[PDB]
C-alpha cells in the first residue's frame, strides 16, 4: 500500500522547492547588486581613461 508513504513523499518533497525559492531570490539579488557595484566603480574609471586617451 503506497497511499500513506507517497503522501509523506509529497509532504517532504514540495516544501523543498519553497526552501530553494527564497535562496534563489536572495542569491540572485546578491549577484545583481554585486554586478551593479562593479559597474558603478568601473564606469568612473573607464570615463577617466577616455579622458586620459591622448589628453
Amino acid at each position: 500500500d503506497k497511499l500513506k508513504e507517497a503522501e509523506t513523499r509529497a509532504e517532504f518533497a514540495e516544501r523543498s522547492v519553497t526552501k530553494l525559492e527564497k535562496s534563489i531570490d536572495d542569491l540572485e539579488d546578491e549577484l545583481y547588486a554585486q554586478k551593479l557595484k562593479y559597474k558603478a566603480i568601473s564606469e568612473e574609471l573607464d570615463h577617466a581613461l577616455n579622458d586620459m586617451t591622448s589628453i
Binding site: 540572485e28 539579488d29 545583481y32 559597474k39 564606469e43 573607464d46 586617451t53
Partner: protein, 77 residues
C-alpha cells in the same frame, strides 16, 4: 680563442627606438579602446539582463504566491 666576432658593418640603437614607437602609442590606443569596448559590451547589457531577471523572478514568485494561496484553499478544507 674567445668568440671572434666576424667583421660586419653595423648597426644598433635604432631597433630600440623602433620597438618603443609602436608600444608607446599604438598599443596604448588599442589597449584603452579594448578596455572601453569590453566595459560597454559587458556591464550595461548584463546589468539590464539581470534587472530583467529580477522582474521575471518577481512575476514568477508572485504567481507562486497565488499558487500557494489556491493550494491552501483547496487543501485546508
Amino acid at each position: 680563442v674567445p668568440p671572434k666576432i666576424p667583421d660586419g658593418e653595423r648597426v644598433d640603437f635604432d631597433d630600440i627606438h623602433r620597438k618603443r614607437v609602436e608600444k608607446d602609442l599604438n598599443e596604448l590606443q588599442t589597449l584603452i579602446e579594448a578596455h572601453f569596448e569590453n566595459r560597454k559590451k559587458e556591464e550595461e547589457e548584463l546589468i539590464s539582463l539581470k534587472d530583467r531577471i529580477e522582474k521575471r523572478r518577481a512575476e514568477r514568485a508572485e504567481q507562486q504566491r497565488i499558487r500557494n494561496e489556491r493550494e491552501k484553499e483547496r487543501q485546508n478544507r
